[PDB]
Structure 1
Amino acid sequence: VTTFVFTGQGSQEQGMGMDLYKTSKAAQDVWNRADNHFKDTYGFSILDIVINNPVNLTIHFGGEKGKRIRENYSAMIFETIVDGKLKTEKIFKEINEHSTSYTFRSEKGLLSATQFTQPALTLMEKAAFEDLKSKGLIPADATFAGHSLGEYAALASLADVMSIESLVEVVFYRGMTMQVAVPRDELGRSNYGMIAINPGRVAASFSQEALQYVVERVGKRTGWLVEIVNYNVENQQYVAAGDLRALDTVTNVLNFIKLQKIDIILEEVEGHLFEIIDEASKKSAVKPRPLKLERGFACIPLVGISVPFHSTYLMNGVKPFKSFLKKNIIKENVKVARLAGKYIPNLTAKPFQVTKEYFQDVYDLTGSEPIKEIIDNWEKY
């Protein structure tokens, strides 16, 4: 009995998957197909980015091929439907019909921006699975799941819902969507990141009781956004996302509650740390907007993440994402037999099932109107 788990964004280092790329015919077909598509559509090589990790990359729009590539960039849009009244769609890039080049810029390497790490990570995981499958090592009834981005790579590997060219295209898009989702103001520095919190490394705590309380009360009367976004290991690993200001506040508060030993197993106990939040916010609200997260007693910063994924911040655009997925996931490629009872989504930690109860549970967690009408007229016979 086998389960395959696909990891999400994290430490994506230079040269990952390249050892397998040199020896495996199956891995070569995965990379070469995607590299050709990137070179023809966007004028860059994902293989070059993985192997060399350049600090900057310029795309030239010189000739007829260059002008075709430029129009591909110009069509890339960002939709955030139900932003107040209705759509407030915009354009990803400052590229216009008179532009002759565009430069991607980074601090120490472009295999750290989410538009390049996400396709690179998806490719290395797809190539590894394709090489495992080419050696007859994949059991027929294996269950699978993926962590954040790994979920999308798992679906493309075990269910084949997309081609390689479509997969990398719709990962590069929605990689650039998040690259512009946060207001990077002056030096491309939006105050957003993630920290891994070990609630047991500080004191007695819980999954959604003690650590979650210091996060929900610091977001309900302070007006800021801090959320627990990953429930990874019970009592030992929880990832918080939000303002880079609030992450420093949380790590300092947890360090001070470690140094000042407390035992917890209004204003008495319920509001005591509410007063703690009030006093910690004053030293925090005056913090300069940019900062670098430091390892603390319970909090270790996540290197490589700059977008508050899995939080309510990225909730205005979920339906434009929903509409984008409908045009790129063809109904004829779904193959429910490869999903039923074997795929465990992150949203619902339950095996995939096409049943009324499964739809009801998804509705009881998202409130999607299409799911609601499906439930209402479930007599689809």
Structure 2
Amino acid sequence: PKTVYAFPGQGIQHKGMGMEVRARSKAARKVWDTADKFTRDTLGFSVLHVVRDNPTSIIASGVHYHHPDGVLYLTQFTQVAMATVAAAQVAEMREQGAFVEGAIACGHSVGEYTALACVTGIYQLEALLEMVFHRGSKMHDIVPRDELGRSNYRLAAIRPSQIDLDDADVPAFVAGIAESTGEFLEIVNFNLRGSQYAIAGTVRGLEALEAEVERRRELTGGRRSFILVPGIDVPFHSRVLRVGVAEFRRSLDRVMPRDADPDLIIGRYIPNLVPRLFTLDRDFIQEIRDLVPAEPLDEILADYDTWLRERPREMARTVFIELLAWQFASPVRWIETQDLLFIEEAAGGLGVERFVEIGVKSSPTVAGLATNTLKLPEYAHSTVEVLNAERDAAVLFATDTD
């Protein structure tokens, strides 16, 4: 069965991330041991201790971090914990024999890296953990902020379904309000086709935004169509973060393996800033070039046929690192990825039978998104079963009787 593996993003962490998985399998225990040994040797903390317990504060090699509700909620540590848990779950699935081999890899804004490390193996988990921790540490200080720690950017989720607004004109409406207020407003996450979007921007702009949304809401009907995302105060996937892209590209070039097999991802990886299936086609490169600037990619466009003939691996690596670097600056396009995954083969789209995500039982966000998209009236005959790697372990591993 042609399947898809979706790895969730932020907002999924919670104390004791699937320790039951660590206790159940023997491969999950091994990968947990390797990960925590490496992270305590190199980074300076015990990811196992950060996950099993939720310490209020920890001391890394040189510096120390704290958080009123556990260090697990900081970007770096939540990132490493998520990556480790996803790797453990995938290893457990694979050792039990219930893990299809040629599955296509996709993920949410940050799960993409874990998905690549897990279901494709293009790079090992160690480099993933190291680069993720370093980048997460660098991210928190990429935006000027008050000495009190407050920043000048927030993001909130809107539900334009009950405003009567349609999908087509949502970006137009956001741009109109931005022009009216003369502030910085930008779509970031296109999660659900009709009734979910994420908008990040300045403060006053956000205030104008939910004021207008509430006025329209009271005009039409009560839905509570605006939720201010808490804690996070950095405009991820926005244009403003396009200054740190160069350093991230340099780091990826430094760490990414030199000799890699493009066949390991071609037709097997759904990037985010460009939803189309990863492919070695001039049109795909042109699209990734004109969507966002990419100087190292320009030399690809000038000469393509000969370069493809002579340096397939090198050009594939260049496009891969360019995509991976630019991903964290451009909005995610989950709507396009979902539609490409669920549309049947006849209508120019991948026909996926099962859509299983490597998540957690507590907060299955991506599974909720998939189910919500499927229950839309656009397609009601789609036989695309949606699974969660923890809620439906019984049916995923095929150990369910009646």
The answer to whether the aligner puts 1:323 opposite 2:284 as a matched pair is no
The amino acid that maps onto 1:362 is: I
Are 1:300 and 2:227 counterparts?
yes
Give 1:95-114 correspondences, 5 Å limit.
102-114=63-75
The answer to whether structure 1 residue 150 and structure 2 residue 111 are counterparts is: yes
Specify the SS of the correspondent of 1:15.
coil
Residues in 2 aligned to 1:351 and 1:258: alpha-carbon distance in whole angstroms? 38
Structure 1 segment 122-201 matched on structure 2, within 5 A: 122-201=83-162
- Give a deviation string over 1:257-279, Cα, whole Å, max 9, x none: 111349xxxxxxxxxxxxxxxxx
Given that residues 28 and 91 in structure 2 are in contact (C-alpha distance below 8 angstroms), is that contact kept between their aligned partners in structure 1? Answer: yes
Letter in 1 for 2:217: K
For residues 34-82 of structure 1, the C-alpha deviation after alignment (integer angstroms, 9 at most, x for no partner) is 21222122321111111221222234xxxxxxxxx44xxxxxxxxxxxx
- Partner of 1:83 in structure 2? none
Structure 2 unaligned runs (5+)? Answer: 310-402
The aligned counterpart of 1:225 is 184
SS in 2 for 1:104: strand
Q: Larger radius of gyration, structure 1 or 2?
A: 1
* Alignment partner, residue 6 of structure 2: 5
Q: 1:191 to 1:30 in 2, by over 3 A?
A: farther
Counterpart contact for 1:33–1:165, Cα < 8 Å: no
Code of the residue aligned with 1:26 in structure 2: it is A
For the residues of structure 1 that align with 2:22 and 2:210, how far apart are their CA atoms?
41
> Structure 1 segments of 4 or more deviating over 4 A?
none
TM-score by length of 1: 0.75
Q: Secondary structure at the match of 2:73?
A: coil
- CA distance in 2 between counterparts of 1:189 and 1:11 reads 23
How far residue 296 of structure 1 moved from its aligned partner, in angstroms, is: 7.7
> In the alignment, what sits opposite 1:65?
none
Q: Using the alignment, how far apart are the partners of 1:183 and 1:215 within structure 2?
A: 24
Alpha-carbon displacement from aligned partner over 1:119-147 (angstroms, at most 9, x marks no partner) = 11111111111111111222222222101
CA apart distance, 1:197? 1.2
CA deviation after TM superposition for structure 1 residue 245, in Å: 4.0
Distance in 1, matches of 2:6 and 2:220, equals 38
**Distance in 1, Cα, partners of 2:211 & 2:12:** 25
CA distance in 1, matches of 2:39, 2:134: 12
1:243 Cα offset (Å): 2.5
Provide the C-alpha distance between the structure 2 equivalents of 1:221 and 1:299, rounded to a whole number of angstroms: 20
Residue 331 of structure 1: SS of its match in structure 2?
coil
Question: 5+ residue gaps in structure 1?
Answer: 60-68, 71-101, 263-294
Q: Compared with structure 1, are the counterparts of its residues 244 and 36 closer, same or farther at alpha carbon in structure 2 (3 Å cutoff)?
A: farther
| Secondary structure, counterpart of 1:4 in structure 2 | strand
When residues 111 and 135 of structure 1 are mapped into structure 2, their CA distance, relative to the original with a 3 A threshold, is: same
SS at the partner of 1:173? helix
Shift of 1:251: 1.9
Specify the alignment match of 2:289 in structure 1.
363
Determine if contact 1:161/1:329 at 8 Å carries over to the other structure. Answer: no
Residues in 2 aligned to 1:303 and 1:27: alpha-carbon distance in whole angstroms:
32
Match of 2:316 in 1: none
- SS class of match (2:271): coil
In structure 2, the CA distance between the partners of 1:244 and 1:134, relative to structure 1 (3 Å rule), is farther
Tell me the distance in 1 between the aligned counterparts of 2:266 and 2:102: 10
Residue 198 of structure 2 aligns with an amino acid whose one-letter code is V
C-alpha separation between the residues in 2 aligned to 1:221 and 1:238?
20
Equivalence for 2:26: 25
Measured after TM superposition, the shift of residue 208 of structure 1 is 4.4
What is the CA–CA distance in structure 1 between the aligned matches of 2:180 and 2:261, rounded to whole Å?
47
Identity %: 36
1:364 aligns to what SS in structure 2? helix
| SS of residue in 2 equivalent to 1:348 | coil
CA contact (8 A) 2:154 2:202 kept: yes
Structure 1 match to 2:165 = 205
> Aligned-pair RMSD on alpha carbons?
2.1
Which residue of 2 is the match for residue 335 of structure 1? 261
SS state at 1:3 partner: strand
